[PDB]
Amino acid sequence: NNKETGEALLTPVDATASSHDGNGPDRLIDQDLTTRWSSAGDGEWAMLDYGSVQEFDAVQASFSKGNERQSKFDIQVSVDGETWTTVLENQLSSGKAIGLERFQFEPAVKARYVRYVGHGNTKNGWNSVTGLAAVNCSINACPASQIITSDVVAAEAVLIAEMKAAEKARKAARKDLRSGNFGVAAVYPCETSVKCDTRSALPVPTGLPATPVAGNAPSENFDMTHWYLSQPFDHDKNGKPDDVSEWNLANGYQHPEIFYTADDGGLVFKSYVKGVRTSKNTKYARTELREMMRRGDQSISTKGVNKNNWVFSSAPEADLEAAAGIDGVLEATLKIDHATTTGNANEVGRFIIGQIADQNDEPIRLYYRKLPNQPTGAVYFAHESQDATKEDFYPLVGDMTAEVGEDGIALGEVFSYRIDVKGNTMTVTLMREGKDDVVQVVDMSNSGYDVGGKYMYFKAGVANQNISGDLDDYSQATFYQLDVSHDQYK
Ligand SMILES: O=C(O)[C@@H]1O[C@@H](O[C@H]2[C@H](O)[C@H](O)[C@H](O[C@H]3[C@H](O)[C@H](O)[C@H](O[C@H]4[C@H](O)[C@H](O)[C@H](O[C@H]5[C@H](O)[C@H](O)[C@H](O[C@H]6[C@H](O)[C@H](O)[C@H](O[C@H]7[C@H](O)[C@H](O)[C@H](O[C@H]8[C@H](O)[C@H](O)[C@H](O[C@H]9[C@H](O)[C@H](O)[C@H](O)O[C@H]9C(=O)O)O[C@H]8C(=O)O)O[C@H]7C(=O)O)O[C@H]6C(=O)O)O[C@H]5C(=O)O)O[C@H]4C(=O)O)O[C@H]3C(=O)O)O[C@H]2C(=O)O)[C@@H](O)[C@@H](O)[C@@H]1O
């Protein structure tokens, strides 16, 4: 009954979404395979509004990276846009095509609103769709080619090649930003002024002022014995960030461009778009601290369930004991001085200010994000779970669209955060003077961070999440508190 021919599809009057990352729902109906609506988390939806009641019996949808993974979804319809009928369930896209694919049901239904309800894909927890449309196969083309068969794949070959040549060019443009050949020359206390005993633990700093003081080195305002600093320039030309070890940081290290005490005592981190990066697994530069519970004793390794890292108290007994501590609290107070104003729809204005990471994934990445056109910014966080097959975002002040108007956190405004892990429960709190705390509690029982062999460390500072803006654009934050604690086994 399906024909190769038919009249034009209806144009939706409105496309909306429960959420997105800046790649908004307007990108579903633009017929461009080069744009996408993206959102993360089971049950997130995009909705086509047709303006009045119409008749449909199918949808056509093209999928972001549709040839590398399969998306999972339902489709639902409504007359009122309050009561929802499910017409297609546990659909799985083909994984073989980036062009349109049809998902058809019998019989037709009457609806004004049609909704895509996403359940991630087979690789990660993202719902990412390049085109969606409700279709009536009595009047509209429902061609054969939208059923993905070997010959549809062969027919995609020219499109695939052109996409890949554009990927390749962007990858080359990104590579040009990564020389690390910039910034004034660093001065390392361990090479210049201090004999550093890298086979011992640093002393515990005492007499740290309650409020950071201008003209103090960061290690005089904060306990810098349990961090190393990742710096985005590469002055010894090994292709890697020039890292500042705990013995250096704890003896007064500062870099006057990117890591230094401000004129009110705050610790400033600045991160440009440009720089070398920590590995091929990220696209982004960072100017960020990485927790080192060995605290300067370099006989202990950086990586491993060992005396440099902690574990959740819900981990197996062997891990609980082999770790330097169990559970953890990071508490920080800071203000954002500047957010990138250039870059693409999901990256502009976005960076990370706190993390907990294991070898591969992040139990949390705390973002701040300000859009160049909004007068305040958003703070929200991600919990990645189940070996990175799942990802959920939780708002704190606004959400990942960062469309907060006047209601978010302004450049210059001081606020606090707390990341608190006790076993398989993470509590994240956002504090602001004269306002109520905002709290999100994350149940991690099924997150798989207690399975055994996973080691944890905190991070704080500014990890850029923008590789697409101008090379010299930057994001910058000033911290006034950085307090880390852990429990001990028995
Ligand atoms: O539809 C869609 O799908 C679309 O998706 C959406 O996009 C989102 C998706 O999620 C998407 O997947 C993507 O996600 C990516 C994002 O990037 C995201 O933020 C996230 O990023 C994470 C990842 O984890 C990522 O991998 C990276 O991790 C960082 C991590 O933060 C840490 O930095 C960590 O650091 C490591 C690392 O190896 C690093 O290089 C470094 O190694 C150093 C260091 O100095 C160590 O101390 C150690 O030192 C040793 C050395 O040998 C040293 O020389 C010395 O040696 C000693 C020693 O004794 C020796 O043996 C010898 O005798 O000599 C001595 C001497 O010489 O001194 O000391 C040693 C020692 O052990 O002490 O190792 C060195 C070294 O160089 O090896 O530090 C380690 C460390 O652990 O500290 O890892 C890095 C890393 O890169 O791995 O970033 C994070 C992050 O910041 O977030 O995940 C990404 C992903 O791809 O999964 O993007 C998302 C978004 O964009 O949002 C949307 O696009 C949507 O629109 C679409 O729909």
Author numbering: 4 to 493
Study authors write:
The overall structures of these PL7 alginate lyases are similar, showing a β-jelly roll fold composed of two antiparallel β-sheets with a deep cleft. The noteworthy structural differences among the solved PL7 structures are the loops around the deep cleft, which are variable in length and sequence and involved in alginate substrate binding with the deep cleft. Structural study on several PL7 alginate lyases reveals that two loops around the substrate binding cleft determine product distribution.
In a previous study, we reported a multidomain alginate lyase AlyB, which contained CBM32 (a carbohydrate binding domain) and a PL7 catalytic domain (named CD2AlyB). One intriguing feature of AlyB is that its CBM32 had little effect on enzymatic activity but rather specified that trisaccharides were predominant in the degradation products when these two domains were combined with an alpha helix linker. To explore the substrate binding profile of AlyB, we screened the crystals of the AlyB-substrate complex using the noncatalytic mutant AlyBH360A_Y466A (His360 and Tyr466 are conserved catalytic residues) and the substrate G9 (GGGGGGGGG). In contrast, only three residues from CD2AlyB participated in substrate binding at subsites -2 and -1. For substrate binding at the “+” section, the conserved residues in the PL7 family (corresponding to Arg289, Arg293 and Gln358 in AlyB) also formed interactions with the C-5 carboxyl group at subsites +1, +2 and +3, and a similar substrate binding profile was observed after structural comparison of the AlyBH360A_Y466A-G9 complex and the A1-II’-GGMG complex. Additionally, the “-” section of CD2AlyB accommodated exactly three sugar units because of the blocking effect produced by CBM32, which led to trisaccharide release during substrate degradation.
